Chain length 216, copies 6
C-alpha cells in the first residue's frame, strides 16, 4: 500500500487474511468490507495481488475481470487520451488498463497516487473491483427476499436475522430496501407476531417490533 505518503508492499498477513476470507466465507456480503479494509491505500499491483491470490472460484473471478474491463472501456471513452510528449515533472494520462494495473508499472502507480493533485488510481480501481464483487455477491445469494417467512414456532429474532441477511445480498437501492422492511418484514411474520406488530403502528422501530414478539 501507500500510507502517511510513502510506499510499502502488501503484508504477508494482510494477504493471508484476504485468502482465508475467500476460503471460509466465499462471497458472503461481509467479504466486501473485509476487502476494503484489507485494501485500504492499496496500489493496483496490491489490488491484483489480492485477486490473483485466490485459487478456486474462477467463475466468479472471471466475472470480476469482465466487470473490470467494462469499467476500463468506459473510462477510456470518458477520458480520451491526448497525444504529445509528457513534460518534465509530469505524468501521462492514465488509461483504463493502467488503472487496472495491467499496463502500468508500480512506479507509475506511485507517481499518480502521490502527485499534486493526486490521480487516485488505487481508489478508482478499488471502486470497480467492489462494483464487480457486489454483482458476484448478489448472484451467488441462495435465497430471495420474497421467500423469507417466519415459521410458526420460530422466535422473531431468528426470522429477523434471516430477513436482514437475505436483504443484505439483494439488488435494491436504499429506497427499495426501505420498502421491503416497510412492507414484507411485518407482512411475512407468522399470524401471532403479524397481528401484534400491526397493532404497534406503521412507524414502529425494530427494537420495538423485536421486543413486542419477545415472549411471543
Amino acid at each position: 500500500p501507500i500510507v502517511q505518503m510513502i510506499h510499502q508492499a502488501i503484508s504477508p498477513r494482510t494477504l493471508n487474511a484476504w485468502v482465508k476470507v475467500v476460503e471460509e466465507k466465499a462471497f458472503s456480503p461481509e467479504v466486501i468490507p473485509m476487502f476494503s479494509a484489507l485494501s485500504e491505500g492499496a496500489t493496483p499491483q496490491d489490488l491484483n495481488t489480492m485477486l490473483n491470490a485466490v485459487g478456486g472460484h474462477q467463475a466468479a473471478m472471471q466475472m470480476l475481470k469482465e466487470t473490470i474491463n467494462e469499467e476500463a472501456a468506459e473510462w477510456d471513452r470518458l477520458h480520451p487520451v491526448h497525444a504529445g510528449p509528457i513534460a518534465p515533472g509530469q505524468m501521462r494520462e492514465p488509461r483504463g488498463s493502467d488503472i487496472a494495473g495491467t499496463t502500468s508499472t508500480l512506479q507509475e502507480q506511485i507517481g499518480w497516487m502521490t502527485h499534486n493533485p493526486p490521480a487516485p488510481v488505487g481508489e478508482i480501481y478499488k471502486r470497480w473491483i467492489i462494483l464487480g464483487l457486489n454483482k458476484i455477491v448478489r448472484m451467488y445469494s441462495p435465497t430471495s427476499i420474497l421467500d423469507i417467512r417466519q415459521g410458526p414456532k420460530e422466535p422473531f429474532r431468528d426470522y429477523v436475522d434471516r430477513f436482514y441477511k437475505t436483504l443484505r445480498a439483494e439488488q435494491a437501492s436504499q429506497e427499495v430496501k426501505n420498502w421491503m422492511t416497510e412492507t414484507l418484514l411485518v407482512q411475512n411474520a407468522n399470524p401471532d407476531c403479524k397481528t401484534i406488530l400491526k397493532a404497534l403502528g406503521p412507524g414502529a422501530t425494530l427494537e420495538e417490533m423485536m421486543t413486542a414478539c419477545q415472549g411471543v
Copy 2:
C-alpha cells in the same frame, strides 16, 4: 486509525480480533470495552469497517443502524448547517451522515479530526455506536436481575458471579444498580447466608460478605 497525529488503516488483526469477539462472545457486555479498545482513534471509515465486517446477527446490526440514524438526526437538529462557500484552510460543518461515514470521505474525516481545534467525528460516532450496542446487550440478555437467587447448595461466590453478571446487562443508572446490591444481593441469598449477612451490618463490603459465607 489516527495516532500520535498521522493516519493509518485498521490492521488485519485489529479487524480479525473484532470479528472473532462477535463470533465467540456474541453480545456479552465485555464486547463493548473490547470494541472501544479495538476502535481507539478510529475514523468513521474504520468504525464502519468493523460493523460491516460482521456477517450474521443482522437483526442486531440493523438495530445499531436505527440507533445511529436517530443520533444523526438529533445532531442535525442541534447543529443546523450554515450556507456559504467554505473559506481556504477551513472545513464544512459536519452533518450526522458525515459523522456516520456515509456522506464523508476519508480525507474529510482526517481533515476534521486533525483540525485546530479538532472536530472529533471518530469519537462522536463511536459514542453513538456504543450507545446502540448497550441497547443490544440489554435486549439480548437472557436473565432479569430479580430472578438471581442463591440455591441451597450453591457456594456464595458462584451466586455473586451470577448476580453481578446479570447486573452488568441491566438498564440502570449507577444509583439504581447501587440499590440492587443494597437490597437484592443479600435478600435473595439462601436462608443460611441470608441470616449470616444480615448480622454483618448494612455497610458491609463484598469481600466481608463473600468471606462471611466462605465456609458456609
Copy 3:
C-alpha cells in the same frame, strides 16, 4: 499506553493476552506480574479496558471496584482540591475518579502523565488495581500454608513446590514469610527428611535442603 513519550492505544494482542490469562489462570499469583507487564506505561483508559474486557469472574471484578473506590476516596481525603481557574499551560489537580479514569478524558490523562513534572495517574491507578488484585488472589487461594505437609512417599522437591506455591498467595509481610520458611518447611516435612534437615543446621539453604533429600 505511552512510551519513549508519545501516546498509543493498547494493542489487540496486548489485550487478547490479558484476557487469555484471566481465562486460563483465573487468579493465580502470576496473573499480577503478567498484568503489570501487559500494563507497562498504560493510561487509566488502557487500564479500564483491561479490567472491563474480562467477562465472567464479576464477583472478583466487583471487589476490585470496591478496593479502587476506597483508594480513590482516601486520595481525595489526602489531596483536597483547591478552587480557582486553572492557568494557561497548567492542569487541574486530579481527583480519585480522574485517576481511576471514570471522570477524566484520555487527553487529560496524557496531559498529566507527560507534564513537567509528571502527575503519574497511570502508575497511581495501577497501584490500586494490583493492591486489589492481591486481595482477590489471597481470597481465592484454596489452601492454607499450615496444611502443606510432606507425604511419606512424596519426593521432597514436590512438597517444596506445594509449599512455596501456597506461600505465594498468603497475606504475610516478608518477615512473616521468612518465619514460615524458617519454621514450617522443615517442621512439616516427613519424619525421614525432617530428621535429615534438622541435622544440616538452622542456616541451611534451600539448595542444600533439597539436595539433602534427593536420594530420600
Copy 4:
C-alpha cells in the same frame, strides 16, 4: 527486501508464508501471485532464500535453475561486459550470475538497486523466476482445456469453475485464451445449457451465460 529506499532482511513470516504455500498448494497458478507478493522489493539474496527454503519438489526446483541459467546466458549475450577499472562512485556492469545472486554480494545488490539510475537486478531476477515458475505450473497441470465438459447433472457454475481453473494453467496468449472461451466454453456445455447459451447470442457475458443456466 528494500523499501521506501533502505535495506532489510526477509522477515521470518514472509519466508514461512512462502514455504507453507509451496507445501499446501504445490504449484497451483495462485502460487505465482503469492510469490510476487511475498517477494515485493526483494534482493537476489532474498529471492534465493525463498527458492532454497523449499525442500521437496527438487525436480521442479531444478527446472527453475535451468530456466534461470538460460535467461542468465541470454543476458550475458545481450549485455557483453566492457573491461576496465570501475571509476569512483560507480558499479560494475552486472552479469547474468550477479543478477541470479550466485556471484554478487548483498552490498553490490544494494548498490545496483539504489543507484541513480537504478540497475533493478531484483526485478530482473524475479522476472526469470516467474518465467520459470509458469513453465512448472503449465507442466504440472493435471488436465487439458479440451477435456473440460459439463456433465448432464452438473450445475453450470461448477463447470465454469473447472473450465477457468484449467484455462489458468494453459500455455496460451490472451488471444488464444479468448478463443477458447469464445469457442469451447459454450460448445462443451451439456445439451440443455448448450442450446440455451446458443440462443443468447455470440457476444453474451459470463454473468448472462451463468444466470441463463441458473435454474437449468
Copy 5:
C-alpha cells in the same frame, strides 16, 4: 527493554514466549540461551517480570531468589555505599537490591543504564539470574555423565546424543568436560565401537569417530 538507546516495555509475545519455554522445556539447558535471548537489553523490572510470570516450579524459583540474594549481598560487600547528597545530573551508587529491581524505580534503572558511562544493572542482574539458573539446571538433571553407556544394539549417533546432552547439564569447567570427552566417550562405547575408536587414535574428531561407527 532498552534498544538503540530508548526505553520500551517487554512485549506480550517476548513474555508469552518465555512462559511457554518454562512450561514445555522446564529446566533443560537450552532454557538459558532462550532466556538470554528473550532478555536482551532488559531492565531489572523486565527481568523480574519474566521470573515472576512463572507459576509452578516455585521450589526452583525460590532457589533463584536465594542465589540472587547471595550475589546482591556480595555486591554490597564489594561496593560499600558512600554517604552524601547526590549532585545534579548524577545517580546514586546502586545497591544489590537496586540491581535486582526490588528497591529501584524503572526511571532509576533507565538512569543507570543510559548514563555516561553506563552503570549496566540489567546485565549485572541478568548475570546473577543465569548464574542461579545454571544451578537449577545442574540440580534438576536426571542423569550423571558416568552412567551414559552405549548399548549393544545402540547406533553410535544416539549414544553421542545421550552423552553430550548429559554433559551439557554437568558442573564442570571446559577443562573437566574436555577430559570427559577425552576419557569416557570412547571408554563407555560398546565393545565393537570401543575397539574401532581405539584404533583411530587419541586425537580423532567426533566426525571421524561418528563416521567410524556408522555401518557399526
Copy 6:
C-alpha cells in the same frame, strides 16, 4: 541483528522459527538457507543464541563446535595478533574466539561490524557455522546418489524428486554434480524411460526429459 546500521536483539519469532525448523526438519538441506535467512545481519551473540537454543541433536551441535574451533584456529594462524595499546577511536584485531562470540562483548561485535571500514565478524562467523552445517547435512543424509534408481512402475517425476533431493546432500562441487546429472540420472532410469531419454540426445533439458516420460 544490525540493520540499516543500528543494533537490535534477535526477535522472539526469529528465534522460535529457527528452533521449530531444527525440531521439524532436523538437518535437511533447506535448514541452511532457512538459517541464513533467519540470521541475516546477526551478531556472533545472535548466532550463538540460535545454536544454543537447540536442545537435542547434541552430537551434531558438538560437531559444529569442532568445526567452528578449526576455522577459529586457522583464522588465528592466518591473522597473527600485533601487540600494543589500541589507539583512540580504534578496535583490537579480532581473534578466532572473538568472532565465534566466546571472548568478545556485544559492544565489541557492534564496534567491529559498524566500523569504517567494517570488520564483518557476523558474516565471518556465519560462514563457519554454515561450513559446519554442510558437513552435518552431508553426514546425516540417509541415501547415496548411486542408489537412486527408477522403479518399473515409478512415474519419472517422482524418481527425479528422489534423485535431486539425494543430490542436494552430496559432497560434490558443481562440476561433480553436473557429471552425476550428465551420467546417472538417465542411466539409472528404468528401461522404458532409459531408452526414450537416450533417443532425445546428450544435451536435452530436464523439462524435455520429464515431459518425454510423462505418458510413460
